[PDB]
Amino acid sequence: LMVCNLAYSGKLEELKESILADDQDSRTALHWACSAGHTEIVEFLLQLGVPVNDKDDAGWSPLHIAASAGRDEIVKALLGKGAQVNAVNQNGCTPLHYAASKNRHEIAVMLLEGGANPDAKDHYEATAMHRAAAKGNLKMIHILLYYKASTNIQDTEGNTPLHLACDEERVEEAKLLVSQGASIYIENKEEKTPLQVAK
Amino acid sequence: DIQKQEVREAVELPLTHFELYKQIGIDPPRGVLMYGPPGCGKTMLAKAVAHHTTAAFIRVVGSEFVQKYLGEGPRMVRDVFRLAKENAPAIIFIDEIDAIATKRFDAQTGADREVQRILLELLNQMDGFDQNVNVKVIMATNRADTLDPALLRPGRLDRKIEFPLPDRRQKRLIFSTITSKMNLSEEVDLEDYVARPDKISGADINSICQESGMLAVRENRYIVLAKDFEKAYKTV
Amino acid sequence: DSTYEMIGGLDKQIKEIKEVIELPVKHPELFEALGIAQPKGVLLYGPPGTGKTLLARAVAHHTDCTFIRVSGSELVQKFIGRMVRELFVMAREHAPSIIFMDEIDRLEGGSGGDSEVQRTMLELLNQLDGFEATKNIKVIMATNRIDILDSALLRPGRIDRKIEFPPPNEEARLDILKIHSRKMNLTRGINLRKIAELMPGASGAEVKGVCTEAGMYALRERRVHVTQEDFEMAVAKVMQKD
């Protein structure tokens, strides 16, 4: 819509007048406001009273944009207005997944701090620990352990985060997870123990 | 940080350091084998390696020499090999080897034994030319059980890049090298869109993405999105 | 060629095999006073001794005879040839010859065509067992890999020769490794004795495993001469797969 060229023009003399005056996938102003990542635009649009939990045809919430784009203050504003911490999209994924994929600490810490579900699984019965483990995100796993997150999340195929961590061949992360009490006996559908996956 | 270093020092270092192998006296291995019935491939890695270097390349269809001729075979493979070692350093991609690597008892079908004599003939010529040949020969297949033990014998194919369970780094690499030429956005994410084709095994995933480009080329939407991805996955 | 200068370590076994193979070569007059005939052949079961073919090509190279294999591993599969009589005609024309299969050393198609080759050599053993065109026609089996079960099962040692060959002489680990070090560029301050004697248990293929698996580190460091530390790393590089 007119948000791309509005916020892209940068003419401050007509932005607040434009918003205070009144796409193909039904994305409102808040979605592009989270895509750009500006403080006064998400706090001004959310200051007027635009709905914070608008869902498109697929279900992509704006919190998946603020979490999938790497913006801390935008998550501070969406959580400031009380956005759905466990919204559902087309694939069932949560903003914690994309928060752990982008390697953003403040987004995950401030999402889980407000009372989000640490074990919120998607349509594939997976959590953010699969992404944080397979992507080598050590500090993301650590800040997930600041809230006593579960470790026995079984994927839709039967894989655990310890399997995705041992597949990356991260010796430090494997010894850390096993040292913290990771179940080394859960077998997936392929009948592969966590010790056999690690070469 | 070991796969790109082993393949790197196994592809780009032997390509322009033949005299050093003449000094040390160790033949550089160049045979890279791809396997796995679930993942077809033969396009992402073949075009990736075939496009990392801006030079000449000569690809061959799996039935490029099957003309039931006994004397034309060695002339064709000798001419292709001499223009590949003399014209410019190219990476020959031999496909569909299971149809030319089958034995037969009856001598009436001399064309099958003849084409397996062509494949084994170039398999012997590459052994006799191990001393720093100016050509790279990669190979791919999908049914290694029907193949002969001479192909998978060491000294010919010393690299076997399989595709059982690629980690997220290989997804960022093999998907970044393909999304760098397409229209990307903040919603374009093919991690679940590649995990599902692992549950339901589908071939030529890259060709399905090209079909998604054929559905997004209608000038109705500039940036390709999840609608053409999931639509191209449920339709074809 | 692979003469005696490229193979060593089986002095007792060549001393015992000169009467099986070398008997019709230089002393055939013992047929009256002894009464010997043409046996089936001989085979060596166990681990690969890194030269399982260099011995057949060595005795065949000293006998001054041709080497015609059956499977045709190197452009000798269709050069001679129902593809079953041409080998017997070339065996009739070339009386001195040594047969040794190297390529044979899915379970549905591979055992189908491979079963056609097994039936080929079985009917060839039936023709050679019934009649005979000329002498000096002997076949040698190869049992070194895991998928070799027909040759080891059909030859228990009742009407054929058998040699226990797990520990050949320890020279299959030592001195043929020295020979494999003579071909490639070797330095003068190397001690193959300890690095060749400190590789027990795994297999007999330590020679080819340490050479071929050491060529990746001699290819990595690009050293003009192979050092002992390269072989020392190759010992681990071949013991990791155990």
Side-chain angles (χ1 to χ4, degrees):
Chain A
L1 293 174
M2 290 73 168
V3 181
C4 295
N5 292 317
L6 180 62
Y8 185 75
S9 65
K11 277 79 176 175
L12 186 62
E13 69 271 15
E14 60 94 21
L15 256 66
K16 68 272 194 185
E17 287 83 2
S18 297
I19 280 94
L20 286 174
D22 194 0
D23 52 356
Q24 293 180 356
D25 293 335
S26 71
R27 271 86 63 85
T28 61
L30 185 62
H31 294 89
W32 297 100
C34 296
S35 178
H38 293 286
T39 300
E40 192 68 28
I41 281 89
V42 302
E43 290 180 354
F44 198 74
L45 286 172
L46 286 171
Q47 186 179 2
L48 263 71
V50 66
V52 77
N53 295 320
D54 288 330
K55 292 182 183 292
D56 55 354
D57 292 331
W60 196 259
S61 67
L63 191 58
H64 291 88
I65 299 169
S68 179
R71 297 292 184 269
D72 292 331
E73 185 68 28
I74 310 300
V75 178
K76 297 177 186 179
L78 291 176
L79 291 174
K81 297 283 103 176
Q84 289 179 357
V85 297
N86 297 116
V88 287
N89 51 3
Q90 183 180 2
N91 56 4
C93 294
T94 64
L96 187 62
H97 293 88
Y98 299 100
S101 178
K102 197 61 68 177
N103 205 168
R104 296 293 183 269
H105 302 89
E106 293 86 4
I107 294 173
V109 169
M110 287 179 183
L111 277 171
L112 295 174
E113 182 67 28
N117 193 1
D119 293 331
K121 295 180 182 179
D122 56 354
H123 289 171
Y124 296 99
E125 300 293 326
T127 56
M129 192 175 285
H130 295 283
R131 298 175 184 268
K135 288 183 182 293
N137 292 319
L138 198 275
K139 299 292 184 181
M140 187 64 68
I141 297 169
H142 198 271
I143 65 170
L144 285 173
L145 264 68
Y146 269 108
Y147 294 99
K148 276 78 176 175
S150 179
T151 60
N152 292 318
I153 292 95
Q154 292 180 356
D155 198 359
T156 182
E157 192 66 28
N159 291 318
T160 62
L162 185 63
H163 291 90
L164 278 77
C166 292
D167 199 1
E168 195 67 28
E169 294 292 327
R170 295 279 80 80
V171 179
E172 294 292 327
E173 293 179 353
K175 292 191 289 185
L176 183 62
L177 289 176
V178 174
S179 69
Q180 289 299 109
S183 179
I184 62 170
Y185 293 100
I186 299 170
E187 293 179 353
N188 55 3
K189 288 172 70 176
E190 293 179 353
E191 194 178 1
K192 291 182 181 180
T193 63
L195 278 77
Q196 290 179 356
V197 178
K199 273 78 70 177
Chain B
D1 291 331
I2 60 170
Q3 184 178 2
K4 293 187 286 185
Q5 190 68 41
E6 183 69 27
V7 175
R8 193 70 59 85
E9 292 181 354
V11 167
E12 76 175 4
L13 267 70
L15 188 62
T16 180
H17 294 89
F18 295 105
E19 293 86 4
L20 188 58
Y21 297 112
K22 292 294 290 183
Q23 292 179 356
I24 65 171
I26 290 95
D27 293 331
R30 83 281 294 153
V32 175
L33 183 62
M34 291 184 284
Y35 184 67
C40 182
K42 293 189 286 184
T43 302
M44 292 183 286
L45 294 175
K47 289 182 182 178
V49 177
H51 280 286
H52 275 93
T53 61
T54 61
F57 292 97
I58 301 298
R59 66 184 68 188
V60 287
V61 185
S63 179
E64 91 276 22
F65 67 96
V66 182
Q67 284 79 240
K68 72 183 181 293
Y69 287 163
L70 57 95
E72 190 67 28
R75 291 181 178 91
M76 289 185 289
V77 299
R78 185 177 294 114
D79 286 331
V80 172
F81 284 166
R82 74 182 294 275
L83 68 90
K85 74 177 73 175
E86 194 270 331
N87 193 1
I91 299 170
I92 298 169
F93 178 75
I94 300 169
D95 196 0
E96 292 179 353
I97 61 171
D98 56 354
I100 62 170
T102 303
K103 65 179 72 66
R104 185 67 178 87
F105 178 75
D106 290 332
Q108 290 85 18
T109 61
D112 183 71
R113 192 174 179 87
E114 199 274 331
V115 297
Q116 80 175 354
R117 189 178 178 179
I118 294 170
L119 182 64
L120 195 143
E121 182 176 359
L122 57 92
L123 186 64
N124 195 2
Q125 290 178 356
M126 67 179 287
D127 290 332
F129 288 164
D130 282 327
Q131 191 68 42
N132 286 315
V133 68
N134 299 115
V135 63
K136 300 291 180 68
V137 176
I138 60 172
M139 192 177 289
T141 187
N142 55 3
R143 294 175 65 189
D145 55 354
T146 62
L147 297 177
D148 290 331
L151 294 175
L152 276 75
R153 193 181 71 84
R156 281 84 170 271
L157 297 173
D158 291 331
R159 264 68 173 170
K160 292 181 181 179
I161 299 170
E162 296 293 328
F163 199 72
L165 283 174
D167 289 330
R168 299 294 180 92
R169 296 291 184 269
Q170 287 82 17
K171 300 294 184 184
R172 290 182 179 178
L173 292 174
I174 207 165
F175 279 98
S176 67
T177 190
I178 198 66
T179 199
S180 296
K181 282 90 172 65
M182 293 179 183
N183 297 115
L184 56 93
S185 178
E186 66 182 1
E187 193 178 1
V188 176
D189 195 0
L190 280 79
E191 294 179 354
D192 56 354
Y193 291 162
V194 78
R196 183 177 182 271
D198 186 74
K199 306 296 182 292
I200 39 108
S201 179
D204 59 20
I205 301 299
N206 195 1
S207 297
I208 302 169
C209 295
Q210 292 180 356
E211 292 293 328
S212 178
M214 292 179 183
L215 270 72
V217 80
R218 205 177 296 113
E219 287 92 8
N220 289 319
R221 187 176 64 191
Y222 290 163
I223 297 170
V224 58
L225 294 173
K227 285 185 177 180
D228 291 330
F229 289 160
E230 194 271 331
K231 186 180 290 293
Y233 289 162
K234 66 181 181 180
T235 55
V236 64
Chain C
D1 291 331
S2 70
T3 184
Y4 282 162
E5 294 293 327
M6 296 297 172
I7 185 68
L10 297 175
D11 55 355
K12 295 292 289 184
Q13 296 184 0
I14 64 171
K15 185 68 173 66
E16 289 180 353
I17 209 66
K18 279 188 285 291
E19 297 88 4
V20 177
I21 306 298
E22 295 292 327
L23 190 144
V25 176
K26 295 180 177 66
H27 49 281
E29 293 87 4
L30 56 93
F31 291 163
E32 181 67 28
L34 273 74
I36 200 167
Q38 293 85 18
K40 296 292 183 181
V42 72
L43 58 94
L44 286 80
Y45 73 99
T50 68
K52 63 184 183 293
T53 311
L54 297 175
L55 182 62
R57 194 176 177 88
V59 179
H61 181 74
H62 292 87
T63 318
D64 291 331
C65 65
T66 185
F67 182 75
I68 297 169
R69 66 191 69 191
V70 175
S71 179
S73 177
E74 41 101 21
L75 219 268
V76 289
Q77 54 185 356
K78 201 177 78 69
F79 182 76
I80 298 170
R82 198 169 63 245
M83 295 297 291
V84 299
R85 189 63 59 85
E86 293 292 328
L87 192 144
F88 190 75
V89 173
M90 293 299 291
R92 186 187 298 115
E93 182 179 1
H94 295 284
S97 178
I98 299 298
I99 298 169
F100 177 74
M101 284 74 74
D102 187 74
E103 178 64 30
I104 202 167
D105 194 1
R106 180 174 172 84
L107 200 63
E108 186 177 1
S111 68
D114 198 2
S115 179
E116 291 293 328
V117 178
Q118 290 298 112
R119 188 67 64 194
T120 299
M121 62 183 69
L122 279 174
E123 68 183 1
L124 284 174
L125 287 173
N126 290 319
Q127 292 179 356
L128 271 71
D129 187 74
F131 286 162
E132 182 179 1
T134 186
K135 274 78 69 178
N136 296 114
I137 303 298
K138 297 180 187 293
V139 293
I140 297 170
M141 282 65 253
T143 303
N144 291 109
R145 289 285 88 192
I146 301 98
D147 205 2
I148 303 298
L149 294 174
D150 188 76
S151 296
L153 193 144
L154 270 70
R155 301 291 180 89
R158 180 75 269 172
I159 49 95
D160 201 359
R161 187 68 177 172
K162 189 64 63 66
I163 295 169
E164 186 260 338
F165 202 73
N169 205 2
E170 191 67 28
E171 267 89 7
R173 196 175 295 166
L174 268 67
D175 79 345
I176 204 63
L177 177 61
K178 186 181 289 292
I179 296 299
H180 288 89
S181 296
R182 289 182 183 270
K183 296 180 177 67
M184 63 184 73
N185 291 318
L186 185 63
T187 185
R188 293 181 184 271
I190 192 166
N191 192 359
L192 293 174
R193 298 290 180 89
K194 55 180 73 174
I195 200 65
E197 286 178 354
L198 266 68
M199 299 184 291
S203 65
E206 292 292 328
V207 176
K208 291 176 71 175
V210 166
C211 291
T212 58
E213 286 293 327
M216 297 298 107
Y217 286 99
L219 189 142
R220 182 180 181 271
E221 194 67 28
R222 302 288 173 89
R223 287 192 296 269
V224 68
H225 64 279
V226 176
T227 188
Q228 186 179 2
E229 197 270 336
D230 193 0
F231 292 166
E232 192 271 331
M233 291 299 291
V235 173
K237 291 296 288 183
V238 303
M239 285 178 71
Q240 284 298 109
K241 291 182 180 180
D242 293 329

